[PDB]
């Protein structure tokens, strides 16, 4: 929710979009077409994986029994051992739940962020030939074909080719 | 396996375990909680 994109001004996601986290749905003369963006999908996924590899780590740290399940140790040192162990259970448990909550906050906002980085980029491509309607869409003020879409997608769309055209409108 | 307790071995890559606080060897750290889910996806918004 940090950046306003996901669950903000984009109304929802597309359960039909199997092949990415982020993509394009267009409407022009010829037809309607959908394709998921690679460069930014990869980008997010990669930050998630880089998080995982940090946690699914194995501690190389070994511990032994100070304790005895078969013949109980003497009661005073038994009680010190138990009290220390519970205190460690407290620390680790707090650490576990905090670590996970915080990673989650950050993961969600990582996603909001990459959406709102796709948007703001395409916007930048199109200069003055279209408009922010505000539901995560661009109204194009010139007729455009399906090879014009692809040129937006793979980031080649030239503006000053369609400038004047799109301007009286 | 590298993590043992009286009732067997804890074999896992996860950082924590809720199986046995007395496990010994090289173990995930013991925690109170039965479950802690880590998001690997984005906010899910359906219609």
């Amino acid at each position, epitope marked *: 929710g940090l950046f306003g994109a996901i669950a903000g001004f984009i109304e929802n996601g597309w359960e039909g979009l199997i092949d990415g986290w982020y993509g394009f749905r267009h409407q022009n003369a010829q037809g309607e077409g959908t394709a998921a963006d*690679y460069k930014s999908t*990869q980008s997010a*996924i990669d930050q*998630i*994986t880089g998080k995982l590899n940090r946690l*699914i780590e194995k501690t190389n740290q070994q511990f032994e029994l100070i304790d005895n399940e078969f013949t109980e140790v003497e009661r005073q040192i038994g009680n010190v051992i138990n009290w220390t162990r519970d205190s460690m259970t407290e620390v680790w448990s707090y650490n576990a739940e905090l670590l996970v909550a915080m990673e989650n906050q950050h993961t969600i906002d990582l996603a909001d962020s990459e959406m709102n980085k796709l948007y703001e980029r395409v916007k930048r491509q199109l200069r003055e030939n279209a408009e922010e309607d505000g539901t995560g869409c661009f109204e194009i003020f010139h007729k455009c074909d399906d090879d014009c879409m692809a040129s937006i997608r793979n980031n080649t769309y030239d503006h000053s080719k369609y400038r004047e055209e799109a301007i009286q409108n | 396996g590298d993590c043992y307790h009286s009732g067997g071995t804890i074999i896992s890559n996860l950082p924590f375990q809720n199986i046995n606080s007395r496990a010994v060897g090289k173990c995930p750290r013991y925690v109170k909680q039965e479950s802690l889910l880590l998001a690997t996806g984005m906010k899910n918004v359906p219609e």
Partner: antibody
Framework: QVQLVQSGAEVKKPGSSVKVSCKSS????????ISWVRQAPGQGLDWMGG????????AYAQKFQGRVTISADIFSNTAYMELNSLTSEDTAVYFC??????????????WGQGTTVTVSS | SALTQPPAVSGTPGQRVTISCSGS????????VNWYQQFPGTAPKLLIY???QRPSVVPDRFSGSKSGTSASLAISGLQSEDEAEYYC???????????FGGGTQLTVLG
């Protein structure tokens, strides 16, 4: 620089199953799709399916659908292919290969060394 | 099958050789083409992707192109080390899976 290291040669009787592994060493491949591609003796390459484990996709070639199970353990950086109901038609070398990306369209640029599976009575 | 290649091509050191790959609308027509090189008993190597793109480690004598539902690999300045099997490949939107050509064996003459 990632290398993919597959499990060793297998010798199998008809009707059995085989599970081959592909370990990503020197780094993770979890953010990429890995495909399984087989090559029967003297024949061409044939796609079996793939998995891209963080993205959450598993795909299968129609001709192997239902007989092959592809999976991954993200924690050991390993992908697996299990083929059931083996016959001599499955005698082949099996490769895992990592795509340039999280999905199966891109060229496969990193390949394992291959695992020979021989089905014989 | 799905993609069709000549079983064999040959040439002399320094000659230019091409290997053709015939497909249909559901693959080459509408999708990008990859080329792989394979030496006997070893894993394939990615030679070309995205139709005409070349990995940095691959010599510039290898080039690819795509027209209609067909593709071509050209090896300029053939070298003795180029004797190998070559496979074309593409996604097929009809089969919903990756497909490969039958392979072309290149022989270095002379």
């Amino acid at each position: 620089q990632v290398q993919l290291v597959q499990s060793g040669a297998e010798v199998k009787k008809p009707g059995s199953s085989v599970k081959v592994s592909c370990k990503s060493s020197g780094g993770t491949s979890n953010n990429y799709a890995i495909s399984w591609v087989r090559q029967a003796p003297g024949q061409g390459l044939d796609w079996m399916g793939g998995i891209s484990p963080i993205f959450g996709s598993t795909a299968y070639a129609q001709k192997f659908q239902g007989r092959v199970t592809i999976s991954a353990d993200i924690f050991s950086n390993t992908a697996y292919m299990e083929l059931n109901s083996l016959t001599s038609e499955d005698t082949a070398v099996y490769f895992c290969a990592r795509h340039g990306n999280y999905y199966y369209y891109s060229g496969m640029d990193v390949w394992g060394q291959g695992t020979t599976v021989t089905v014989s009575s | 099958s799905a993609l069709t290649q000549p079983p064999a091509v040959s040439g002399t050191p320094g000659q230019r050789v091409t290997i053709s790959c015939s497909g249909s609308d559901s693959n080459i027509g509408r999708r990008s083409v990859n080329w792989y090189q394979q030496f006997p008993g070893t894993a394939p190597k990615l030679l070309i992707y995205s139709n005409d793109q070349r990995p940095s480690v691959v010599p510039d004598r290898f080039s690819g192109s795509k027209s209609g539902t067909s593709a071509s690999l050209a090896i300029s300045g053939l070298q003795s080390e180029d004797e190998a099997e070559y496979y074309c490949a593409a996604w097929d939107d009809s089969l919903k899976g990756a497909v490969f050509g039958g392979g072309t064996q290149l022989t270095v003459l002379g």
